[PDB]
Amino acid sequence: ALTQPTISCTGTSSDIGAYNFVSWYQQAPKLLIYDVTNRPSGSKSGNTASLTNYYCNSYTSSSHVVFGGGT
Amino acid sequence: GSLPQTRNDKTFAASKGNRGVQAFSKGSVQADLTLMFDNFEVDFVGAA
Amino acid sequence: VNRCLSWRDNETSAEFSFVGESTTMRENKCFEQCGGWGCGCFNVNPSCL
Amino acid sequence: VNRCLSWRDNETSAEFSFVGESTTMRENKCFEQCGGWGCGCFNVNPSCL
Amino acid sequence: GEIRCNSESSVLSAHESCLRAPNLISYKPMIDQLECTTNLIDPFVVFER
Amino acid sequence: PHLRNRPGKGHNYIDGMTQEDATCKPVTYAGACSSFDVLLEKGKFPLFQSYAHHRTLLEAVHDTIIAKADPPSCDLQSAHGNPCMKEKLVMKTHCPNDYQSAHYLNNDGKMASVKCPPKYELTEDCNFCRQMTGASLKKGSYPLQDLFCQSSEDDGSKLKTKMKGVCEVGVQALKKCDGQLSTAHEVVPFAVFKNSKKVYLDKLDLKTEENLLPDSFVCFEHKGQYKGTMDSGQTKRELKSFDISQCPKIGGHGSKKCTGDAAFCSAYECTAQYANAYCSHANGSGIVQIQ
């Protein structure tokens, strides 16, 4: 899973570090940010994404979906 | 029987570079070598 | 090509099957030709006649 | 060594398997060389090329 | 005609069906690198002669 | 089954496909690894089978010998609309069934792999993914190319493809030509050097020289062996891998008593007490040099 406490979503090299497919949800949660930056503000750096109840999800190298711990 | 030996006027000997043997015998040949597509030219030779 | 050079003179090709079985004196040959787009075939190996 | 001298000219070695099947005229030879640490091999029996 | 074939394509492709004499290829297995070379009568030279 | 005593770590697994770590983490005589057992089938992968004691592509990747390409494996599930399958589509391969992934050495000299979406399998040409109901996919990835790797420090930054009469081989544009262009599929040998790209060759003139480095020794141990690892009663006679880093070097210190054959005794220090492992010299290992 991801590590959560601008909310920071920190992961391993498998998620976020490799793929730029990370999304955020506000809580039936509501999606706010997809594809790191796109909105229907966030960013990435190293293995940690940042967003300026909020949950983060990402795509792993094993074709799985990993959800954040939550803030 | 090291190579520099003459037998019935043949005098076999080592070829240059010791890659084989020769046979020195009386005779002659006619050689007419031919060139083809000979092209080797540069530009710096224009100066005198 | 292996079939092309080793063609027996008494063996008929499949193209001339309308001849079928005939009692006339006959022989069959195979000749290699050019292979390439200039010849008419995409492949560059030699064609057959 | 027994395989080394008795190498048939029409038999291909396993090292040159990328050649695989080819229609080109070809032959295969095997030559004995030195065997020993100076040659490059720990064994003292002759190597093969 | 030390190396002879049955068609122009076989000559131009060095097909394995071509016949040749024994021991045409000279091998120099010197310790650094092998030298594969041979001396062949150029048929074009004899044709022009 | 001495070929299953892999040099180095022997990690024959790929990132993401980590469901076979029981037998693909260091490959031993015991288990079965899908991404390694295909190499030992008779008639397939003959070049590696000749140089059977050298590292594979996955082993070389896990020893940091060969790097991993950018998008190491762009999944067809998430990146099927990206110009990924370009170097793969110029190769003519043949995958068996029930394989969800396949790795190869790309043009830059790194390792890249193609991964089908979950529950899909690669077709017979490894170009498309197809789904079969009630099929058990293998947990490894099929090695596409026949190659063997090693550790080298020789520099090759000035090395480049030099093929005569070839306008373009694979994905490399050697030159620009106009007119007739005979296009075909051919078996081209290739090599990869340090700090270089793939170098296709017209001829393969390669030689091997032996040495006494640790990668040239196969060290094993018995299961149930007295005073050794796994010292318990066994119902079958099976071997176990051993790490040569423990056997002391000649005139040096070590942690395990170690015995071996003539080459090992010349290189390492063979004990006079009861030994813990037997270290033979590798069947064919060494250093391979290409002309």
Place this chain on the structure above:
Amino acid sequence: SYAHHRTLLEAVHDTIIAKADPPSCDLQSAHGNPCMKEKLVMKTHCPNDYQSAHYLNNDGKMASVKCPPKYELTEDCNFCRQMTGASLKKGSYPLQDLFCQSSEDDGSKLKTKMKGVCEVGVQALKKCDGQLSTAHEVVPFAVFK
């Protein structure tokens, strides 16, 4: 061929051949001692279910290797391995191919004289420097009084 001459064990029991110091240092109690030195230079082949194996050491006496209880000697007779529910044989495997006899001829001046040999087995014939072709070979041997 010489089937009506004594074996090594028979020669030992007829006082023809003596028994070595530590006659057989058990691997159970002496695995950390420099025992297996002459055995490790021989290439043998033991069958299964054998707990002991005897050989004629360099001094001309009989020594043997005995595995700990319930263990058996491996295929190279170099290690002991344990199998559950296995019935070990009650004897010891003869490692070498030899026959013995009773002799009074003296051989105190007899020594190994091999040409071009720096070292055979555990005997250091001489001191040599440079190339050293090391191999496993079948060497005939004799033991005199």
Place this chain on the structure above:
Amino acid sequence: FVHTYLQSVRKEALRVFNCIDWVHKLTLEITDFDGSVSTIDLGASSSRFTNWGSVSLSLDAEGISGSNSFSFIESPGKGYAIVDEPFSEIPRQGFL
């Protein structure tokens, strides 16, 4: 019962061969344009693919000079020699 095996005394070998025929062979030094670093060797009715094309030799007079009935010995790294016996493909006691 006697079992005999042969062993080599000296660590050297000699190669014995025969010359079926002799061939004329010309060595040429190709003083090329702007540089004379070119030396080639070629026989009768043969061509060599040098730079700027190829060079062929006719040598129409005589492509051969008969045969012989001696044998030749080569010691690698030491030279050659001639022995006055016919080259026999079947071993014979008391001969070479």
Place this chain on the structure above:
Amino acid sequence: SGDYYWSWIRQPLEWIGYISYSGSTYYNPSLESVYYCATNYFHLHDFGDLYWYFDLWG
């Protein structure tokens, strides 16, 4: 119709698995053998099946 991935999520979130349009099922490794169902229904990407961009929650 539209190449959708119907997935199941739960909150005691945590992804459980998905069933695809083609009938392919993928499960969480831990659970291989409140509940919502959200699928990527509007932010479809032509280059990939980004099914974790969950919207239209159940």
Place this chain on the structure above:
Amino acid sequence: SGDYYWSWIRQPLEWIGYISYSGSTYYNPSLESVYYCATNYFHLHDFGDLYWYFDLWG
């Protein structure tokens, strides 16, 4: 853990047998087919398994 030999002794001493760390069992030849249990637990020798140096009696 530590390569111990758990042995059984009796006094009507007399050694009965031992069970090893590896599961190997060795019995007295007479009994092959007060009770104490003492094992070499402190005076371990690196060169051999001197299991008859009994201490830590049961």
